[PDB]
Amino acid sequence: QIDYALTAVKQGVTSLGIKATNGVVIATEKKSSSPLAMSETLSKVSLLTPDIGAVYSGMGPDYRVLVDKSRKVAHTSYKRIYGEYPPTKLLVSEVAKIMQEATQSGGVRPFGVSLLIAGHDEFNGFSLYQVDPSGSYFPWKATAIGKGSVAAKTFLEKRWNDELELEDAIHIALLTLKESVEGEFNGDTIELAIIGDENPDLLGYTGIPTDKGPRFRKLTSQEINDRLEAL
Amino acid sequence: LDIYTCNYYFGNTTEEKLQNPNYLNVHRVRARIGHFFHKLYVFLSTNFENNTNMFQILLHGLKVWFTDLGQETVFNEDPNAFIDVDFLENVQSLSHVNEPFTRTNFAIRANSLHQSRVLLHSTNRKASKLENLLLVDIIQLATSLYPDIYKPAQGTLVHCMKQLVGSYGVVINKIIPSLEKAIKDHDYMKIQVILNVLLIKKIHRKLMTDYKDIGRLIFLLIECCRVNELEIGMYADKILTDIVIGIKIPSSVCVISDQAFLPLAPPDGTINLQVEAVKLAKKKKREYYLSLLVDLQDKLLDKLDNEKDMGWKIRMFILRFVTQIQSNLESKPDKRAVFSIISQISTKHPEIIHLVVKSLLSTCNKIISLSDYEYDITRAYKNEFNPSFVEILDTSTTSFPKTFTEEMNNFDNPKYFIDLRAYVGWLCWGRLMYVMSPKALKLNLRENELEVLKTAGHLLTREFLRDVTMNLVQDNETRGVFSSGNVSFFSLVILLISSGFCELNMSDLFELCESYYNKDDKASMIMSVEIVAGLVCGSKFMSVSDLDKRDTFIENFLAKCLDYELNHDAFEIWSTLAWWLPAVVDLRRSKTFFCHFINADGMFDRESDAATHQTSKIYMLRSILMSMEFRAPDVGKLFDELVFDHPYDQVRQAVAKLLTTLVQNQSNPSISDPTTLLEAERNDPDGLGLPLKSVPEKVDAYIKKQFEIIKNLEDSVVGLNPQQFIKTDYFYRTSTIFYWIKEMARGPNKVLLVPYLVDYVLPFLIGLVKHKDVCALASLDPVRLYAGLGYMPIRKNHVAAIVDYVCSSNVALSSNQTKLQLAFIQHFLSAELLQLTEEEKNKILEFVVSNLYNEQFVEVRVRAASILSDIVHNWKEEQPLLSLIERFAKGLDVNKYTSKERQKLSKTDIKIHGNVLGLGAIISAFPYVFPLPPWIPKNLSNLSSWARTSGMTGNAAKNTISEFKKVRADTWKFDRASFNTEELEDLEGVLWRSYYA
Amino acid sequence: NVNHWTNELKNCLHFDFPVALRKSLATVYYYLSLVQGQKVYRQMHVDMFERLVSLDDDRTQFTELLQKQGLLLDHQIMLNFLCEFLPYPDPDYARYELSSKEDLQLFRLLLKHAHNAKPFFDKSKESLLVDTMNFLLSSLAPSTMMAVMPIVTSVVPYHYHIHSKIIDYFPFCYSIWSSVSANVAIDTHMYDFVGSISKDVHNKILSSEHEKDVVGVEFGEFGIFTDDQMTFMFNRLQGHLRTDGQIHSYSRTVKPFVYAINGSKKDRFFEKLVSLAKAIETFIHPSNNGFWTKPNAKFVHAFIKSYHGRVKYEEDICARGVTNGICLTSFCHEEIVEIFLNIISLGSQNKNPDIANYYISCFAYLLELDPSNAYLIYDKILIDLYDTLADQFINSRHRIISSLKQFTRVIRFIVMDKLYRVHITNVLSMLVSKLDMNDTNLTSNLINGIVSIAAFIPIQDLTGEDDYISFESDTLPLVQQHFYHIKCGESSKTFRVDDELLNNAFKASTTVFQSMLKVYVEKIFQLVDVDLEDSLVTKINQTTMILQESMDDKIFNYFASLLNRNFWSNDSFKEKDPNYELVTIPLAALVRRNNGLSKELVRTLLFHIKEQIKRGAGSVRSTSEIQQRDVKLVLYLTALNDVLRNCHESLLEYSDELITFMKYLYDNVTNPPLDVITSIVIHSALATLCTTEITDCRLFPEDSKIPEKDRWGGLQFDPRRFDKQHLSFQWHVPSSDEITLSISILESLSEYCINNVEELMKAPRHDSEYGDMIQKYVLVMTHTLSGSSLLFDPDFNKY
């Protein structure tokens, strides 16, 4: 029964993640259920904290209500006690605990998604985690989930060294996604986020030098196309 | 040439085709497509290595180009627009009826025959230069690194070796070279892939036949046994282990009735010199192979002896020289092997040691079997079972039956032994009987085989058996266990010992044994007793002066161990030996061992002390006597020595379980001749046969005594109580006899127990008005046994006397042990139904019915009726039936009496309780007559005016109407209509319990 | 090499050869199987022998002909092997131990081989019987029980002599038996024995040589069995079904009972069988499931197979002049039905559907006996069915599905009895309309009925224009009267109708075929949109293709303009992912029968495919899924594949318009999931020119190949069902014209692909609408190699 949910994960659009020396990167494709639909109204790559993002493979809805339940747990169980935001390791723990309970609870099915959660905490540095429907979670240098899972996972072993700059890992995760792509391949059908330098540009305010802004940045429709030309 | 013929258009191999423009046109086009697929493969592996979707579509274009030649095999079976032959066959074919088919079917059947004539054409061929180029490509792909590519390519290269000749050769001579590379190019996932290839059904199979290349390969899979980094080495071990389990070679002259090839012998004169030529090449092809393995054998022992320490895949070697320095069909027993296999005891590792034994014991039982076969390797597979020490015996010999009996009791001057399970005899004599000779020899072998066994005994030091058994004990603490593999190893040390090669003297195994006997350590005792069983399997080994040092050690040891002070841990072990040993060796190879358990200083008789002890014997003597069952059983003693009077249960029960076994040993009917026998079976009362197993008079006497000794003592409890009962001798006897019956009715002794039921066993048991509460105390269930004896192997003539015992005119004797005999009947009936003569089927029914009426016990009038239905169910004939219905409904029918009276009668009159109980059973005996018999309504109506009366009968007439209305429930939508009688209403009261109002 | 040839031989049995050579071949494989000393593929050799000695190689029996042709085999070799499985003293040497698969599995083979070569042990070595028993017997003891018994049953020959017969040894079997209680480890051998021996005596008594040295074995009341011997086996079988459940494959356990019946002295036996049915009665009841419900079912079937088995072997012999009073009479068939009818009716309602299909399958076996009773069964089955279609069982699921299985396993027989047959038009047009779209199961069990009625009935208007006709007025009124009669307790023997009126009813009943197919096609298009899947999608296509072949040109030419009509104007391919199969294939099967229909059907699929492409279909890229705006284009393309494949020579007309359309379909339209489809067009057209196949499957040929119009039950029982003028199959054979267009294409598409691909070797690594195009041309190339596969020669490279 957990086994059947991992199966809904095995199909459903491919997504991936790559840790580097100075950043993390996660991406998936935006398969348009129609051309009539405006694909900018749905986000497969969601912000959890300004230091932490997430992507999935599988059941759309189960991801949404998991991204919501997940943002909240970041406050209710960490920020409202210690004044900081949670560290990747622990926010991940609190999500696994959330899914692991849909498993061992009666009257409910587990979630139809595997999650890739990427982020940076001051003490543990960068890290990238996978969370399964089983509630188990593992730390990755890089991996992929979904259909293209096997092709891409093999390409990542081939191309990954522990000396990658974040720009190198963006480059990789675009190629990796180019071979699996189901629909068209541009900035309107690729979602890519990074966990890099602090972006003060994006704080919304200026006056306390101790807080410096989001590490999580979601690349614009433009930034993507720009990289795909010099590709 | 051609025998398949499928309308190939271009003429069936006439080379009516070669002179056809349309046919060079066609293949000149498949050539281009072939050379174009290579053009595209090189263009992709060069420009697009990192793509899976492309390479899959190409790999299917090759699965096609290589296969869809004569036929169409991919797409072969997609539902298309033809009706399916297999479907239609199911619809139309009746069985035992030749082709009852409609025209439609005949037509597919025929089309189905054409289509199979096409697929018949063997497409197997010689590689076409270009075809070799594409098969090399398909390998670089099954050697690729992407699972999304290498997995279809492998499946695609298998459909391609089905199609090419000795293509396996092409594949290996590419694998190995490019695996040897991927190892000196480091941790490659190309190694992980090459190993995945070697596990393909078709390859892994052809591997155990590649004698040339498996040399080099095992040494590559070894280098591979280092997870320098991956799932490798786990796969290399599964693979090297899979390998040890294949291979071998057959020298042995097909023990063929030369009539297996003669009938097909062509006239051709000596144009069958060819045959004696093949015989010779398929004989040095073989002898080369056989040498390649010996070369591999010695080239490994090199990497095991010389490689200071490789770790624990030290195991492949040993797991293999073993299925080799003991194969035969050749295999020159190497002495350097027996050295190396033993010097691996120095790694003090549980798994290695368990194997060095398992190996040393086979590597000898092979050399041993060369002497016994006189190097006539053929002689194994010839059922003229050679061994110089086996001897056949004629059993028809007027006199034989009493050689056996009086030779099985002979322990001192023994003439023959049957190690194993003694078949001949038992039923009858007449066959020839394979047997073994006394003081069995060792026999001679050539020098090569001699120096090999020397190199073991010179290695079996006082110290080496110390190290090795120690280990086997510690790996053994976890489990318990016995494994004969252990014992059949000690007999070996014994052969080696006093045959010359070891010189350890037996007095060394007597310490090694007395040594491992810590009354505390279980796995340590198990090693001691594993040792004993070896000294008794070591009489297939000379010295009558050692067979006396051993008979002497054993009576001394069984003393220390079994003569008082015995835990449920020892008993657990020794009792294991008793069930086993007598089955792997005739116990007369020892004067002391058996003549020790039968020395019965153990069975006291009364209780104003502590009586004494235990089945500190009984259950072990028994488990030996159980495993012989035939042989040795002279026990004039035991019978005269049994107890019955014993106060304790653990013994009363055991004395019983032993007698049971003592009887099964004198019950074998072993007759003189097969002819003398079948003449006894033919002249039997039952058109059937002889009671198989029949207890011999001198015993039918003993038993009869024990029952009539207990009838003598009925004065012993002239009036005592349950507390002063368990203490009387009458009880003690009775309890033992019971435990005995319980154990006869179980298993293969039933046919022995029957004669006694009618006069002895059933009059007993119903020793129950001999006190109900006395049974609850010493927990005995008689009721459950007496009735559980309703089912069982009864014979035509025994039925007679049993039905006559029940249905007794002395019946009236018993009291609520009546509802007991009545339940024994209900069971007999179910297991002797269809076998009871309509005479007996009546003596029963007239008893059952005489109980619906017995004044006093209301309890039974009801258990009788419940049973009367079991009868009337198989009673469909309508005049036995309709004549009962009448007999019963005469005691009630109509308003014979006016209301006030029915009330009075319903409470007291027995003749009417019966009449309503009976007529009630009849109706409850037809539960589901799918359309309802009109005698039922009309006779429930006669029953309803009575279920309206509260009393005792009017009660068991409400039972009958509710019981009924209930089982008719689902068929009731309909049964309603056969009740015109507004005596539908008449059936509404009926069920009343306290919760209704 | 041995194993290879031993196979090419297997391949040779498909044609014929001299019994004098079988004498030879058999002898080779008897002694070959028994080799020792090397790796041997025994299963193969014991199977050669068993096929060389086959006792029913198309009604011919090769064991008889080999006995008569002087075959004799050594028994000492066989028994000597089967005896290595005895306790050899000195454990160190015993090689075979039962219990451990690898060994028991050889033993089970030798034993099987022996059973095969039992009849070739010298009938003339008088002391071969006695010698062999006097040996096995002395070997019998508790520890051998397991290996001895089976041997006897398969290595000792059934001999019968003047002094020592084999039934001489019975009193000893009923000594072991009758001493242990029911124990399958034992019984199974006793029944196997006294039964394959009772079968023997019976076989031998009839026709052939009533002897073998002794007709001194008398039959009587209970086969070759004593009064008490029979009595015992009855109460033991009852023991098995009521108490101890100790039996395996029952075919074997039933023999003795069947082959102890004596047509002229039954009575005393049927008396014993009846009381055994009355005992067993309750345990079959649908709500008394237990350890027994298997044994009772697997038996009541095994027994009625093994009875009908015998009957159809005797009726084959009273086609050889020899009645024999031992034979089974019309009155045994009667009392057999009397016995097992309530029993069979109860079982078929059982809660387990497998345990039911046993009791239900017994109706077919009983009806083949054409007993006087036949009506009793047709009576039940038809009420149970008409009740079910009148929803009188709606509260109970099982009765509905059950009484549709009862009726299916019996359709073929109803088409015969000149009374029931009337109902069959009604019952069909009722099943068709009651095809549910929610109940997958009810539908699978209805198609069962619908396809069975079609498989044994010609969909034909049989009216000579007789004016009274009409389904009502003439059929319905009678059908209702028969049913009213049957329902009120009365049976069909009491049912009197004019041979005039009942033949009006039957002929007028063949009118409704038209108004009913309009309702089947409707129900198909409704099913295109259901998550029924696979097994049942196929079975439905069988029913649509069988229905077609059982159709006269009058009706078929209607059915065609009704698929054609509904295929175009339909509102039925919405839901996600459709079963196109259910509608495209039934078209192809129209073109099989009438190539003329292709010229225009294809040109309409193309000016409708060009239409869908031109308006954006397959414009939007996706692996993994077929876009729902495409679903229409995909229909027309599957149809074009399925319908070219069956076009054949009629494709010569519009040859050039196709090729040039195929090139258009590949110039436009790129999309990995559509290319696996479009690339099949090339195959379904190369295969259709040069593949040599059938073409005609009609129940009855031409429309006119008159056996007359008493032609219902499809000749399935008539001996003319297979004289050559009926079976006048059509067949497509590839002509010099077709092979020639065949080849034109091969080179024209072969070039088209290789060019367009040698072009794209000016590499855009990006595009990805590039790897889509190369995949496309390599699929078109691939499917160009297949189908077109029949023109290639494996051997070409030798030459």
Swiss-Prot record, chain A:
<keyword id="KW-0647">Proteasome</keyword>
<keyword id="KW-1017">Isopeptide bond</keyword>
<comment type="function">
    <text>The proteasome degrades poly-ubiquitinated proteins in the cytoplasm and in the nucleus. It is essential for the regulated turnover of proteins and for the removal of misfolded proteins. The proteasome is a multicatalytic proteinase complex that is characterized by its ability to cleave peptides with Arg, Phe, Tyr, Leu, and Glu adjacent to the leaving group at neutral or slightly basic pH. It has an ATP-dependent proteolytic activity.</text>
</comment>
<dbReference type="InterPro" id="IPR001353">
    <property type="entry name" value="Proteasome_sua/b"/>
</dbReference>
<dbReference type="GO" id="GO:0043161">
    <property type="term" value="P:proteasome-mediated ubiquitin-dependent protein catabolic process"/>
</dbReference>
<dbReference type="InterPro" id="IPR023332">
    <property type="entry name" value="Proteasome_alpha-type"/>
</dbReference>
<dbReference type="GO" id="GO:0034515">
    <property type="term" value="C:proteasome storage granule"/>
</dbReference>
<dbReference type="InterPro" id="IPR050115">
    <property type="entry name" value="Proteasome_alpha"/>
</dbReference>
<dbReference type="InterPro" id="IPR000426">
    <property type="entry name" value="Proteasome_asu_N"/>
</dbReference>
<dbReference type="InterPro" id="IPR029055">
    <property type="entry name" value="Ntn_hydrolases_N"/>
</dbReference>
<dbReference type="GO" id="GO:0010499">
    <property type="term" value="P:proteasomal ubiquitin-independent protein catabolic process"/>
</dbReference>
<feature type="cross-link" description="Glycyl lysine isopeptide (Lys-Gly) (interchain with G-Cter in ubiquitin)">
    <location>
        <position position="89"/>
    </location>
</feature>
<keyword id="KW-0832">Ubl conjugation</keyword>
<protein>
    <recommendedName>
        <fullName>Proteasome subunit alpha type-2</fullName>
    </recommendedName>
</protein>
<dbReference type="GO" id="GO:0005634">
    <property type="term" value="C:nucleus"/>
</dbReference>
From Swiss-Prot, chain B:
<comment type="similarity">
    <text>Belongs to the BLM10 family.</text>
</comment>
<feature type="repeat" description="HEAT 3">
    <location>
        <begin position="756"/>
        <end position="795"/>
    </location>
</feature>
<feature type="region of interest" description="Bromodomain-like (BRDL)">
    <location>
        <begin position="502"/>
        <end position="586"/>
    </location>
</feature>
<feature type="short sequence motif" description="YYX motif">
    <location>
        <begin position="995"/>
        <end position="997"/>
    </location>
</feature>
<comment type="function">
    <text>Associated component of the proteasome that specifically recognizes acetylated histones and promotes ATP- and ubiquitin-independent degradation of core histones during DNA damage response. Recognizes and binds acetylated histones via its bromodomain-like (BRDL) region and activates the proteasome by opening the gated channel for substrate entry. Binds to the core proteasome via its C-terminus, which occupies the same binding sites as the proteasomal ATPases, opening the closed structure of the proteasome via an active gating mechanism.</text>
</comment>
<feature type="repeat" description="HEAT 4">
    <location>
        <begin position="839"/>
        <end position="877"/>
    </location>
</feature>
<protein>
    <recommendedName>
        <fullName>Proteasome activator BLM10</fullName>
    </recommendedName>
</protein>
<feature type="repeat" description="HEAT 2">
    <location>
        <begin position="633"/>
        <end position="668"/>
    </location>
</feature>
<comment type="subunit">
    <text>According to PubMed:12973301, colocalizes with nascent proteasome. According to PubMed:15778719, associates with proteasome core particles and also forms a complex with regulatory particle-core particle (RP-CP).</text>
</comment>
<feature type="repeat" description="HEAT 1">
    <location>
        <begin position="170"/>
        <end position="209"/>
    </location>
</feature>
Curated annotation (Swiss-Prot), chain C:
<comment type="subunit">
    <text>According to PubMed:12973301, colocalizes with nascent proteasome. According to PubMed:15778719, associates with proteasome core particles and also forms a complex with regulatory particle-core particle (RP-CP).</text>
</comment>
<protein>
    <recommendedName>
        <fullName>Proteasome activator BLM10</fullName>
    </recommendedName>
</protein>
<comment type="function">
    <text>Associated component of the proteasome that specifically recognizes acetylated histones and promotes ATP- and ubiquitin-independent degradation of core histones during DNA damage response. Recognizes and binds acetylated histones via its bromodomain-like (BRDL) region and activates the proteasome by opening the gated channel for substrate entry. Binds to the core proteasome via its C-terminus, which occupies the same binding sites as the proteasomal ATPases, opening the closed structure of the proteasome via an active gating mechanism.</text>
</comment>
<comment type="similarity">
    <text>Belongs to the BLM10 family.</text>
</comment>
